[PDB]
Ligand binder design. Structure first.
Ligand SMILES: CO[C@H]1CCN(c2nccc(Nc3cc4c(cn3)nc([C@@H](C)O)n4[C@@H](C)C(F)(F)F)n2)C[C@H]1F
Length: 299
């Protein structure tokens, strides 16, 4: 019926990696910036290490299962796990952090080209997850990470399933707990709104229990000031009541790619194209034998 999942789960020794500093901390545990120095390979790989009760152990292994099973340039994969007293997930270091914080902090240097290219990349990553029959269930700008300003990836498979974030959820999901690739499209629309408003909070000040009612009446997130009607119409289509009436991720790739070819026709930003963001062709952008996880293949 379903294809065998032949993904390899790499078990890493504690001695092969070192923690440098804390990147983030929450109820889940803590995420560290680190370096992975495998076997006798002559490589140093920058990594994010998530360090974690037997039920929270099952939750991290379920996320590890999904994360080890993906392989796409716009999705974050699991590099390996370490089985210590506490289970650790070894992931790629995304040095610019999450896209949500990035748009808030670099707003004055974010042009239309970057915003539209990020929409294309997220749609590509989501289309890949759809090809793998994976429903994300938690797509949001907080769960899109920045490898470089020109390269983003979807992460956080903590809610991902085969075949709660109320303000990012489709109406069928809030009311009936129905999740499909089309409910991920709704979240995609909310994520694009977060990018276009440079990280505004959706339905700010409105309690989560009031969202279902507000959506049923037909209220939607407002048109961001930089968006032309062309961009907003796309967002609005992601928020149709009929799931099948919403665009598909494959069509979202096409639509945002056409717009990314003439970005100033679709997003109106003051001082656009005179804006500068770090690129791997900059002084001290990037230390001996350091290799990015994307260039380090198999054991
Ligand atoms: C709740 O766990 C999440 C944590 C983020 N995850 C993730 N997936 C793949 C790569 C990756 N690397 C990654 C994550 C990073 C990072 C650099 N690289 N810098 C930050 C801070 C400064 O913003 N973070 C956040 C999201 C946090 F600290 F929370 F992790 N991080 C996916 C899940 F493990």
């Amino acid at each position: 019926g379903e294809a065998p999942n032949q993904a390899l789960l790499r078990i890493l020794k504690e001695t092969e990696f070192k923690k440098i500093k804390v990147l983030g901390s929450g109820a889940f545990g803590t995420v560290y910036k680190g370096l992975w120095i495998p076997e006798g390979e002559k490589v140093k790989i920058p990594v994010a290490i998530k360090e974690l009760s037997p039920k929270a152990n099952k939750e991290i292994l379920d996320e590890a299962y999904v994360m080890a099973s993906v392989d796409n340039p716009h999705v974050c994969r699991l590099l390996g796990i370490c089985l210590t007293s506490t289970v650790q997930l070894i992931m790629q270091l995304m040095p610019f952090g999450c896209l949500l914080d990035y748009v808030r902090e670099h707003k004055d240097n974010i042009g239309s080209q970057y915003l539209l290219n990020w929409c294309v990349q997220i749609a590509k990553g989501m289309n890949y997850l759809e090809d793998r029959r994976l429903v994300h269930r938690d797509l949001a700008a907080r769960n899109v990470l920045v490898k470089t300003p020109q390269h983003v990836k979807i992460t956080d498979f903590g809610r991902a399933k085969l075949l709660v974030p109320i303000k990012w959820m489709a109406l069928e999901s809030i009311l009936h707990r129905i999740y499909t690739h089309q409910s991920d499209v709704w979240s995609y629309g909310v994520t694009v709104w977060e990018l276009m408003t440079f990280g505004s909070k959706p339905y700010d000040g409105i309690p989560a229990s009031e969202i279902s009612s507000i959506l049923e009446k037909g209220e939607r997130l407002p048109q961001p000031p930089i968006c032309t009607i062309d961009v907003y119409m796309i967002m609005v289509k992601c928020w149709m009541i009929d799931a099948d009436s919403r665009p598909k991720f494959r069509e979202l790739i096409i639509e945002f790619s056409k717009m990314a070819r003439d970005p100033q026709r679709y997003l109106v930003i003051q001082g656009d194209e005179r804006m500068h963001l770090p690129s791997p062709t900059d002084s001290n952008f990037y230390m001996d034998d350091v290799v990015d996880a994307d260039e380090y293949l198999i054991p």
